[PDB]
Amino acid sequence: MDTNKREIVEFLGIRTYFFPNLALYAVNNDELLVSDPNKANSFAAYVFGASDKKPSVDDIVQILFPSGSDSGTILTSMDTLLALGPDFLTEFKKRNQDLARFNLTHDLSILAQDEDAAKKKLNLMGRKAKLQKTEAAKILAILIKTINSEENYEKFTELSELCGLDLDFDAYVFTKILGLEDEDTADEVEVIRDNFLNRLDQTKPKLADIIRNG
Amino acid sequence: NKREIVEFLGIRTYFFPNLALYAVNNDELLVSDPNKANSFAAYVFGASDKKPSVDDIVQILFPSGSDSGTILTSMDTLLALGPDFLTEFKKRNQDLARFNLTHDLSILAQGDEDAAKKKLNLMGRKAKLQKTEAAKILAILIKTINSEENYEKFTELSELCGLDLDFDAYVFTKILGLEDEDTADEVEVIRDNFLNRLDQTKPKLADIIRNG
């Protein structure tokens, strides 16, 4: 969107900040994901349980940055790249370089530009952001806490805060793509999954059925 | 017996309903003659620098004639205030047993504290993922109980602001001494969040918090 603001969007029961084009894809293509998942998008097929083939980095980047993406789409998807960790940081820097010609930049560019000191400054920034009363500030706080997490369990704990903004879909997608479900987190992942399924059961039962079954 | 947030004329609270009522009922006193006001209220609202006693706090949390819901809510407050209030918590819980009532976190007051806290940690993490205020309050309470140091306690109590329970976070900060060089900027945000609401109903009382 032609805005710099972090905004939650929704598509037919799927509320999302980090993955709007994935949500839209799934809403449009649910019958294809049921009936011929190998011809469907591999990121969507994996997330929704239609395929056990993990998407590539390229598959993910393509969904995050479709052709004709505007500045708000790019900046939002750059947040997603940061949350996705080191395999996506070179892509983040590329997208940030592209924006500079337009006098645009990612607001957390201090990371990519003494990372320890940036992360401590960001830690304080995120703690104050969370105390603000807006969704945009709370998303920023969760992003910072996720970036500053060192191990998977901490990262899962901080991403789980997305469920407090009814962003269970995003927490679920990150859990799937980053491999955060293990013996310690499994019961909590099940609650997150069930929160998302509770919304899906009302709008896209086919998608719910794939996630539950196959 | 459900955990229910309440409000008194601009003061939204879970943990301190009788403190909020006291402020509604003694507005003028706190603004105009605070040396005559209740010491816990006077301290919280910035009218006095004298810290309240344990008994002062307990009497506001458990007024004479308190019913079982009031008792159970205030026992949550005792647990959040920490080990200094555990003997009071156990006494209140023992008295409830005759009526077939108990606090739902009674395992804390029994054997093996460490094992109970590990079990409560997992329950709190699942509770926070539920979509109700009652479950989210339980999760914050557990996370506070399981915090050892002031900074961690402050971080977990700050989550009350996500339920617009800034008043409660502010009261706990005042009573537990959580404001220091590391937390002062965040305490100011929490205070201002509460005052932004209090300004709409009792601006002269909000002014005492700002200015003494």
Author numbering:
A (entry chain C): 1 to 113, 115 to 215
B (entry chain A): 4 to 215
The publication says:
Two PGL proteins, PGL-1 and PGL-3, are key scaffolding proteins required for proper P granule assembly. PGL proteins can self-assemble into granules, both in vitro using purified recombinant protein9,11,12 and in intestinal nematode cells or mammalian cells in culture when expressed on their own. These in vitro PGL granules display liquid droplet behavior, indicating that PGL protein alone is sufficient to recapitulate the biophysical properties of P granules in nematode cells.
The NtDD has a novel fold consisting of 11 alpha helices and a single N-terminal beta strand. While each ASU possessed two pairs of identical interfaces, one of these interface pairs consisted of a network of conserved amino acid side chains making extensive salt bridges and hydrogen bonds. The complexity and conservation of these interactions suggested biological relevance. Recombinant PGL-1 and PGL-3 NtDD each dimerized on a sizing column combined with multi-angle light scattering (SEC-MALS). PGL-1 and PGL-3 NtDD interface mutants formed monomers rather than dimers in solution. Based on insights from the NtDD structure, we designed two distinct PGL-1 mutant proteins that are unable to dimerize in vitro and are severely compromised in vivo for assembly into P granules and fertility.
